[model samples]
Target: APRSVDWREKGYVTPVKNQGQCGSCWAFSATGALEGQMFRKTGRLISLSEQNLVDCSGPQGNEGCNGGLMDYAFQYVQDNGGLDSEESYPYEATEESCKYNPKYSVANDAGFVDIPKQEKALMKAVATVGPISVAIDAGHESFLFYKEGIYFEPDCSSEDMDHGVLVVGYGFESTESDNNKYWLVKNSWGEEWGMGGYVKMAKDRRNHCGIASAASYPTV
Candidate 1:
C-alpha cells in the first residue's frame, strides 16, 4: 500500500461545486465518487449531475434538497441505467420533481460497496480505491470557518453525522518532527469554503466527525 495518496493531484477529482442552501451534499458526494471512478476507468473526467439524482432518486430513499444518503443515490444511478451530466441536468439547489431523461445520461455505475465503519478501512479505501463518499458530523462552527491546518474537533460526534463528502486523499504533514496525518476531504460548498473547497481533517483520531462512518464508493 502507498504511504500517502492524493487523488486530486492525479487529475481524478472534479472541481468543487456549490450546493447552496440545499441539503444536497449526498448527491454531490455520490456524484464525486462516480466521477472519480469514471475518470479512472475511461481517462475522462466528466461532471455528473447532482440535480438528476436530487430530482429522480426519491424513490430510492433520497429526500432531494431536504437531505439524503449516498448509497441510495448510487443505487438510483445504477437502477436508472445511468445519470445525466451537470451540463444536462444542472443543479438548482432546490427540491424539484423528477425530470431525469435517459437520453441525456452520460455515466453509469454498475454497483457500489458500503465500507466498514473504521478508520483503517476508510484510509485503505481512499488510498487504493480512488475517492470515496462519506457522511460526517459537519455541524460544528469551526468546520464552517476552516481555512487551513488539520481539523479535529474534540467534541465532534461520530454518531451525529449530518453531512456527506468525499475523501479524495490521505497523507501526513510534518513539522518539527511532529507528524499530522490528515484526510483530504472535498466539500460541495464551492471554492471558497476551506482550502479551495477542501479540508484536511485529522486522521486516526477517533474518525473525526464520523468521516468513516458511512463510507462507500461506486464501481463502474
Candidate 2:
C-alpha cells in the first residue's frame, strides 16, 4: 500500500501460484492472504493448503473446491484448529474426499479483520496490517489475462466460481510509451494467464471491479 517500498521488490511475495482449472478462487485467495500473514509473523514463507479449506470448509457452507465465502472458510480454519501444509494435503484441482488432517496443521489463525470497502480504509489496513484476501466480480468481470497496462473492469459483483487473486505488492508500470500505476497481483489463473503468474490491476482501491468491497484477512 505504501509506495515507499514496493512489497514485491522487497521479496515480500512468495511465488506465482495459480489454481489450475479449479473454481476454488476463494480458497486460493484465503490461503494467499494467510501465507503473507504467516510469512510476516514467522519470518518464513510456507504454502498452506487450500485443499484443507476446500475440503473441511464445507461444514461452514463452502462447496468444496467449487465456490465459497472467504469469511466462512476462515472461520472453518479457526474452528478446525488450524490449516495443513500443501505438502500434507496437496491441491488436486478436482474435488476429492476431505483429507484434512489437523495433526499436520502448519498454521493457526487467531482471528480475522474485514477490510473496509473504501480504498482509503483498505490502504491503511494493507500498509498497517498485512496482505489481505479480496473478492472480484467474475466475468461480467473477466479481467487482466496476461494483459499488461493496468487491467480494469468497469462492472463487478457477480456469482462466485473462479475469479479471485491477491494484492501482494503495489505501484506503477510503464510499457515504454504508456505509463500506468497499478496493484501488483498474484493470480491463481496460472502464469500463462497473467504477467508471469500475476497481473496488474487498476490502482484505484475503491472496490475496483467490486473487489476490496469484501476484503478481509486473518491474524497469526
Candidate 3:
C-alpha cells in the first residue's frame, strides 16, 4: 500500500535552484534532501550549502561541478563535521578553491540512511523520514525538453543513471484511468523547467533510471 504524503502541502520542499550549465546536479540533490530533513526536524527551512559539498566533498570521491554520487555527499556531510548554509557559503556554480571554513557552518549531521532499491520501500522511507536523493538517466531529448505530465520514458535505462534529483513525495491520480503512481521530484535546473524545476516521475516501474538505487536522506 502507498503511504499518504505530500511534503509540498506541508511546506517542506525548498525553492528550486539553478545549476546553470554545470554538472553539479548531484550537489543540488543532496542539498535538497538535507534541507528537507533539516526543515522537518527543526521546523525551519534553512538552505544548506552545495558549494561546501562541491568543494569539500572531494575526499569522498565527489567532483566539484562535474560529477558525483549522492552517497558520497551524505558521507561528506557526516565526515566533514557537517555543512554550511547558503548565507555563509553561497553557490558559485563553478568549481572554486576552498579551505573548509567552519565559521560559515550552520548545521550538523550525525549520519544518514540509504533507502532500499524497491519502490515501495523508498516510498515508506520518504513518508516516514523526508525527501530522498535520487538519480535518473537524463540522456534523452525528451528529458531535456520535458514540459509537463508524468514522465515515463519507455526506453529509459534504469541503470547507472547520469542525472541527480530530489524525491520529495509520491502518489497516484484519483482515477481509474490507469492507477499510475509517481514520485514528486525536484530538479536544480532553475524554476523554468518542468513545474518550477520539479517533475513527477513514474514509480513502481522497477527503479526507473536507478532512482531507488541511489535513494538517501540526511539526519539532522
Candidate 4:
C-alpha cells in the first residue's frame, strides 16, 4: 500500500541546468527525477543526461523546457530502456539533433496531464518512487535571486509558469533566527543562484502555486 511521506525529510542534492533557455523543461524534469531515482536505487547520485531526453524523447511541443508533460516523458524512458549519464552525453542546453544510440530512444504520447492539480500526485510519486519531474514559473527575476531560506511568493496570477525543474526531495527547516519551514528543491538552472540554483520553497505555499506536475516512468 502507498503511504504519504514527506520526501524532503529524506535529503536533497544540488540542481543542474537546461542551457540556452530552450524551454525544454520536460527534459530537465524527466532527467532530474530519473537521476534521483537512480541514486535511491543504486546509492550513486549520478547526473543522468538531459541531452538524451531532449534529443530522443519524441515530439513534445514548442514550449521546450518552458513546458511539457512529465508522464509522457516517463513513458518514453520506460520504453527506451533508460536515459544515459550526463558524463556519457553532456548537455548543451540548446536544441540539437538526437545523437548517441537511436536504438535507445522511445516513443512519446502527445497528451499532457492537467496542470495546477497534479501537485499532490507529483509529490506522492516522488516520495514513493524516487525523484519526480515538475515545472514552475521561473523567469529573469528568479534567475538571479538567492537566499538561505524561503523568501518569495509573488502573486501566482501575476506571472506565467515558464520553467521546468526536478523535485529531488522535500523537508522542513528551523533556525536560531527563523522558525519557518520550507521544501528543499533541486533546480536545473546551474549552480549560481538560490542555494546553488536550487530553491527552498515554503512547502505549504507551493501547493497553492500549482508548480508541480508528473512525468511517469514505465514499469517493466
> lDDT by residue for model 2 over 1-220, one digit each (tens)?
3663345654446666667777788888888888877877887778888888887788888887668877887888788888999889988887777787768998888778888777666667667766667776657435644466667665544334245567765665666344466666677876677667776666674456665577788877
What digit string (tens of lDDT, one per residue) describes model 3 on residues 164-206?
Answer: 9998888875533453787888999889888888877878887
lDDT of 2: 0.72
Reference-based lDDT, residue 212, model 4: 55
For each candidate in the order shown, give its overall lDDT on alpha carbons.
Answer: 0.91, 0.72, 0.82, 0.56
Point out where model 1 deviates above 4 Å: 175-179
TM-score of each: 0.96, 0.87, 0.93, 0.71
What does each candidate score in C-alpha RMSD?
Answer: 1.4, 2.7, 1.9, 4.9
Question: Candidate 3, after superposition: displacement of residue 9 in Å?
Answer: 2.1
Work out candidate 2's RMSD over C-alphas.
2.7
Q: What does candidate 4 score on TM?
A: 0.71
Q: Over the stretch 30-95, how does candidate 4's per-residue lDDT look in tens digits?
A: 666655555555565666666777776665332344446556566656556556667778877765
- How many residue pairs in model 3 have overlapping backbones? 0
Which regions of candidate 3 deviate over 4 angstroms? 1-3, 174-179
What value of lDDT does candidate 4 attain over all alpha carbons? 0.56
Deviation in angstroms for 18 in model 1? 0.3
Model 2, residue 191: distance off in Å is 1.4
Q: Candidate 3 has what TM-score?
A: 0.93
lDDT of 1 at 113: 94
| TM-score for predicted model 2 compared with the true structure | 0.87
